[PDB]
Paper text:
P. gingivalis displays two forms of fimbriae on its surface, FimA and Mfa1, both of which are crucial for attachment to other bacteria in the oral biofilm and to the host cells. In the work presented herein we have determined the crystal structures of the shaft protein Mfa1, in both mature and precursor forms, the anchor protein Mfa2 and a truncated precursor form of the tip protein, Mfa3. The resulting mature protein thereby has an empty position in the first β-sheet that a β-strand donated from another fimbrial protein presumably fills in order to polymerize the individual proteins into a polymeric fimbria.
Instead, the mature form, mMfa1, which could be purified as a monomer, was used for crystallization and structure determination. The mMfa1 structure revealed that its C-terminus was partly located in the position where the N-terminal extension is expected to be embedded, based on previous structural studies of related proteins. In mMfa1, the long C-terminus fills the same position as β1 does in the precursor form, albeit running in the opposite direction. The C-terminus does not reach through the whole sheet, leaving the short helix, described above, and part of the neighbouring strand disordered. The metal ion is coordinated by the side chain oxygens of Asp507 (bidentate), Asp509 (monodentate), and Asn512 and the main chain carbonyl oxygens of Asp207, Asn512, and Gln514. Instead, the end of the C-terminus reaches to its own empty β1-position and partially fills it.
Author numbering: 64 to 214, 230 to 563
Amino acid sequence: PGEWAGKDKIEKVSIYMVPQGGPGLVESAEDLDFGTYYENPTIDPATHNAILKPKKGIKVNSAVGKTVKVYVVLNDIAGKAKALLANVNAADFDAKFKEIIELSTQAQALGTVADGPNPATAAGKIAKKNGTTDETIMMTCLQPSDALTIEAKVTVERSVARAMVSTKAQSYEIKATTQIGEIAAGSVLATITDIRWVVAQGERRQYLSKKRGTVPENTWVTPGSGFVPTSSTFHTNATEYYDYAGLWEDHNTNEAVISGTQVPTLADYQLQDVTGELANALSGKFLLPNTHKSGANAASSDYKRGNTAYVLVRAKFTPKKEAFIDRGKTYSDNTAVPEYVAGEDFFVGENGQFYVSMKSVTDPKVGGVAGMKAHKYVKGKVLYYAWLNPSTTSPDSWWNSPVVRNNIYHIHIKSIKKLGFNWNPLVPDPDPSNPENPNNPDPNPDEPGTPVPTDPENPLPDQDTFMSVEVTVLPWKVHSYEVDL
Ligand SMILES: [Ca+2]
């Protein structure tokens, strides 16, 4: 990436002076205009941190003569720190600075079609892209200054993580691995085009500043860390913790078209002066942290498909007409099977074969099977999951995927290898007894009793991979900001 990993704007500075030793009065200087009170950042080439040096003194008022610790929030642009910390006693302040803020309500965590293409997301409320120029992101200190007496330095880290996605190519050729209609193993089966992405299941709340856990399997805890969904509790409780509004980003109401944000190539990241829309894709997407107890297997890892942040990749799968086992045949009712038309719905049976309709799927005269179910791919839409931080890599072993603030998770797609899923079960359904779900852009299009493509109670890894990807975790160019006082 390089220059696309973010350039920061500091708009506001909030300083909290907290007397030590027991009950007492906090002195706060909130939402100070950065330019008025601070010099422009200078980078420490050793640490890659930026240092903010004050120009103007802040009035210490009642804290004069006291031993205090200093806490800092930069860019409290949603007012969340101010509101949480209001009228908090000095004795309660350190604990309060680690308590929970809510970026989206449980109701706001679910969007609908009317919220596209630019839905408010939880993380976007405290991480703003200012045109293509720079970005304003909330930051808080993991720990306050050392104790000092008024007559030091406070390091802060960004409150969001960033997801970035790239692809080797904008099209992929798919080969059959077994006989599919007239297509032999090793021959071309389909082409994938029009690749897009969104991110979901980051959290909707967060600890104001990073909160250490109690066991080594989860260094930093998040409000949702203890939530381990079953197939049923996912639907009733997932929105208590996670944000899904982002599923509607760059949504398109034409089902012939693939919804979501473009996925740039590596070369796109080297282009100078870029369109607005591509610039937005290149700078990625923000999400709030999401961690669970890590383990070495399904039983010991608390990371589940229904509680882990994911990138959803969407694309157009165009199969060769010759792949259809029903091609050229005659139905049991003595009518002819129509050839597949590119871009139209297609149906993939439990047997892996391709059919132009459900009528074909269950008619043995055309290579169907009575009683057999199929996945309906709506106008050829296919879906794939990528986890943000597979720990470790790479196929059937990435049991864990923590997302921690102030990190960038770059997912590079090297290839899409096979047919994906036809809908996204990793979205809470307010009435799970029916397939309708206005909160999901990719609801279940299948007939009753069709096997689900995946389940929220499942572990992360795939037995055999749908995509080849490499994930890189990196810091912002400026790792953290140091505020001098
Ligand atoms: Ca439903």
